[PDB]
Write a protein that binds this DNA or RNA. Structure first.
Ligand SMILES: [Mg+2]
Ligand code: NA
Ligand code: NA
Ligand code: NA
Ligand code: NA
Length: 320
DNA sequence: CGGCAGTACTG
DNA sequence: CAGTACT
DNA sequence: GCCG
């Protein structure tokens, strides 16, 4: 990163807008920050600032203040509420609206939340694991978690395919959580496995708490056995084999990679989701789907790239 | 002016 | 529905 | 916040 002196300051503002609910302004900052990290050389001129996609007049102005004075005065006017709003929205299940409500109600610490706040089932689990969920795990531990799910799944049906996606598949040395995708090549026998799989994972205490228990998605909490283990976030998605490539692409990410690819698809009259790549998608002027279109055959991830006119990228070069 | 990705789940 | 979450 |  040629421009840490700039991005470190912008990241503070980005996070401030995010926790206060100003999601589109925060998005613009996040995109400018990534663009700046991608640039080869230091940004040295306002003219060079606007040069970059994602950098407008306002962002170029802030870059020029930083280079000339080494500071951004805007940082000095960030609301005193922001560190508390960040503290609260780092509880799993609490976002900007819940954080702002707790702040308005006078809560300033997790002790206040613990002792006085009305918590959802999800949020009580988030609070109970507050520290652990802010920690990453070594890639090796993610391997052990993936293998634990796979062995439980294959005990029911040897034919089930299980793959750890997210940052693991993108090759990262550490992982925030584990993202396991499950399917069956026979196109049918992925159905109804959750009850048995999850109960199997419960029985010797690997699965410690459930956050979401849907027909397709599980989100919860696990812990490997033995001393020195922390609780880890675990997500499981079960999909029919017909959707495997698009589900794999979705679940491998990154989030910004997916958003960029989906935006591209929309420009080409197509729609990309974890279910399918569709074409002849009829939308309105608001960019919203009014006609479904046709699902395009995507047996592999490479087929999705090809149909979008893009060269294939291995998971490691999707880490946007 | 207005989209900024597209979807699942909760209560 | 609004909110929060996932990549 | 940026961009078409
Ligand atoms: Mg993940
Ligand atoms: Na620009
Ligand atoms: Na949260
Ligand atoms: Na009180
Ligand atoms: Na996850």
């Amino acid at each position: 990163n040629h421009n840490l002196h700039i991005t470190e300051k912008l990241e503070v503002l980005a996070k401030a807008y995010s926790v206060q609910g100003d999601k589109w302004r925060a998005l613009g900052y996040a995109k400018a920050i990534n663009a700046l990290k991608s640039f080869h050389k230091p940004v040295t001129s306002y003219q060079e600032a606007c040069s970059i996609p994602g950098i407008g007049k306002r962002m170029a102005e802030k870059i020029i203040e930083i280079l000339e004075s080494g500071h951004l005065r805007k940082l000095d006017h960030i609301s005193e509420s922001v560190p508390v709003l960040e503290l609260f929205s780092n509880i799993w299940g609490a976002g900007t609206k819940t954080a702002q409500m707790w702040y308005q109600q006078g809560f300033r610490s997790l002790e206040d939340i613990r002792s006085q706040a009305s918590l959802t089932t999800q949020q009580a689990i988030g609070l109970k694991h507050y520290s652990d969920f802010l920690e990453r795990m070594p890639r090796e531990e993610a391997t052990e978690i993936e293998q634990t799910v796979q062995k439980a799944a294959q005990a029911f049906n040897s034919g089930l395919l299980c793959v750890a996606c997210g940052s693991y598949r993108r090759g990262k040395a550490t992982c925030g959580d584990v993202d396991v995708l499950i399917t069956h090549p026979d196109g049918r026998s992925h159905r109804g496995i959750f009850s048995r799989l999850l109960d199997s994972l419960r029985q010797e205490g690997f699965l410690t708490d459930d956050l979401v228990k849907g027909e397709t998605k599980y989100l919860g909490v696990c812990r490997l056995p033995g001393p020195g283990r922390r609780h880890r976030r675990l997500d499981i998605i079960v999909v029919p084999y017909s959707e495997f490539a698009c589900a794999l692409l979705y679940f491998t990410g990154s989030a910004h990679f997916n958003r960029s690819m989906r935006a591209l698809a929309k420009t080409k009259g197509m729609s990309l989701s974890e279910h399918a790549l569709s074409t002849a998608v009829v939308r309105n002027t608001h960019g919203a789907k009014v006609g479904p279109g046709r699902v395009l055959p995507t047996p592999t991830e490479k087929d999705v790239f090809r149909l979008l006119g893009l060269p294939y990228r291995e998971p490691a070069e999707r880490d946007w």
